[PDB]
From a paper:
KDM4 (JMJD2) is a conserved iron (II)-dependent jumonji-domain demethylase subfamily that is essential during development. Vertebrate KDM4A–C proteins contain a conserved double tudor domain (DTD) and a potential zinc-finger domain at the carboxy terminus. From our biochemical and structural profiling, we find KDM4A, KDM4B and KDM4C DTDs display different histone-binding preferences. We show that these DTDs use an aromatic cage as a general mechanism to coordinate trimethyl lysine and, most importantly, the sequence specificity is largely determined by side-chain interactions with surrounding residues.
In all the structures, KDM4A-DTD forms two lobes (HTD-1 and HTD-2; HTD, hybrid tudor domain) with interweaving β-strands. The co-crystal structure suggests the H3K23me3 peptide forms extensive interaction with KDM4A-DTD (∼540 Å2 by PISA31) and such binding is mostly mediated through residues in HTD-2 of KDM4A-DTD. The structure of the H3K23me3-bound KDM4A-DTD shows that the trimethyl lysine group of H3K23 is coordinated via cation-π and/or hydrophobic interactions by an aromatic cage formed by F932, W967 and Y973 of the reader domain. H3T22, the neighbouring residue of H3K23, plays an important role in the H3K23me3 recognition by KDM4A-DTD. H3T22 side chain forms a hydrogen bond with N940, whereas its main chain forms hydrogen bonds with N940 and S938 side chains. Unique contacts with H3R26 also contribute to H3K23me3 recognition by KDM4A. The H3R26 side chain forms a hydrogen bond with KDM4A N931 (2.9 Å), whereas the main chain of H3R26 forms a hydrogen bond with the KDM4A-DTD G935 main chain. Besides main-chain hydrogen bonds between H3R26 and G935, other main-chain hydrogen bonds are found between H3A24 and F937, together forming three β-sheet-like main-chain hydrogen bonds. The intermolecular interactions determined from the KDM4A-H3K23me3 co-crystal structure involve all residues from H3L20 to H3R26, consistent with the clear electron density of this region in the structure. The molecular arrangement of the H3K23me3-bound structure defines an H3K23me3-specific interaction network and suggests that modifications on H3T22 and H3R26 could play regulatory roles in modulating DTD binding.
Residue numbers in the entry:
A (entry chain a): 19 to 27
B (entry chain A): 898 to 1005
Write the structure that this text describes.
């Protein structure tokens, strides 16, 4: 699958 | 944990859980980066790093500024966080269909 992003903390 | 040939439970493409068999173990390397907007990705391919040649010369140092080609084609600025050697499991279901998944998606 392709890379995904998200918020941290 | 899991070895090859083992029968496990994992999620099918249809959404439901099924017994499936573990046919291959691969160790696969994913990069983690902190984008400048405060977001992060830990499942990047090494070749998604466009400011250096990582397949040939390895990962950027930890905390190094990098430029990343994202999944929309466009380049974003980031800092390198880590390369992750992750245990992958290629699993086969009764209908002959195979997935490649990681540990939290496979059940003993």
């Amino acid at each position: 699958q392709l890379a995904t992003k998200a918020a941290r903390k | 944990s899991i070895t090859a040939g083992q029968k496990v439970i994992s999620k099918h493409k249809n959404g439901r859980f099924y017994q499936c068999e573990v046919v291959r173990l691969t160790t696969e390397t994913f990069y983690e980066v902190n984008f400048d907007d405060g977001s992060f990705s830990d499942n990047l391919y090494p070749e998604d790093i466009v400011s250096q040649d990582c397949l040939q010369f390895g990962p950027p140092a930890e905390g190094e500024v990098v430029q990343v080609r994202w999944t929309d084609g466009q380049v974003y600025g980031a800092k390198f966080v880590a390369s992750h050697p992750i245990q992958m499991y290629q699993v086969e279901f009764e209908d002959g269909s195979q997935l490649v998944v990681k540990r939290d998606d496979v059940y003993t």
